[PDB]
Curated annotation (Swiss-Prot), chain C:
Belongs to the UPF0045 family. Pfam families: Thiamine_BP. This is UPF0045 protein MJ1052. It comes from the Archaea.
Length: 98, 99, 97, 100
């Protein structure tokens, strides 16, 4: 990485009803192809790594799901700072989660 | 006796105090322990599982707790609810093989 | 009165292509409350009491859930205590009014 | 605008700096978006964009980065709504929602 950040992604296919886990699992598999730390939770997936890699993984993940459906709503949230390292563990420690 | 279970995610961001906002966020998270909710904090937000009304109240309090020490706060609440299957963190994670 | 400016986005997960149909229903719900409502292409901005917004949010979400099996709704709140916060004030502060 | 893959999006660039006021930084981000080949419609909680997906991703990164140059931390969000069965435009969504 050159410019590390911490992010969270959510990819939701529309028009396929409520059972969409099969599509979401596909998106998660996409992130794992990149040089990123992947921590999936029940409402999205947190990523740690190069900003460009995250942007590319986000687009691919979104696009992969869209390939199987007609509409997808995807969200990408980036948290980047200059005063400290941008890592998952640092954020967790800062709030006493470790 | 009445449980309308949903899974949600909350993020509270205090503004005007620079980059170091963890001290405020920690306080907001503490609030959740007072409610009958499952709490799973991650690096970008806090996932909650429990009654919808309880999550709405916990959200308002967490938001307000931070606003007490800062001048401005931007808070987000996302709700995921379905009526065909149980709304639990465990089931969602199992469904995608994370458990 | 505890005024805030907020944004609500509701995603209904159905098997048809028209979601706007259900979202329109959610927007009508907002209008039953004492709130200023400004809908845009990605969500609806609300201005009014925090409690009223929380109630309106819950009802809008629930109304859509009555038509589809799953709904993902988001509520974002921007509250400040140093100044009065309103839709028009926020817009003018950035020269977008 | 010029595109190969049009989508409708909403962005919010939140600077974590000194003082509750962030208007200066927010306007800076908005000016960045306007420099790209996109339709820009700012509302009180975010900025809606219409244009090519890649142009939006580029604009997003630059807006986020330009704000980060002035403050020590930035939390930026991008939400994309893309469909293949109908055109992805602000106008269509507004007409479909009863606003136009």
């Amino acid at each position: 990485f050159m410019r590390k950040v911490v992010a969270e992604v959510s990819i939701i296919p529309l028009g396929k009803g409520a059972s969409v886990s099969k599509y979401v699992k596909k998106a998660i598999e996409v992130f794992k192809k990149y040089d990123l730390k992947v921590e999936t939770n029940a409402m999205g997936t947190v990523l740690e790594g190069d900003l460009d890699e995250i942007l590319k993984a986000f687009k691919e993940a979104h696009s992969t799901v869209l390939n199987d459906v007609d509409r997808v709503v995807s969200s990408l949230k980036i948290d980047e700072r200059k005063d400290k390292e941008n890592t998952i563990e640092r954020k967790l420690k800062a709030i006493g989660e470790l």
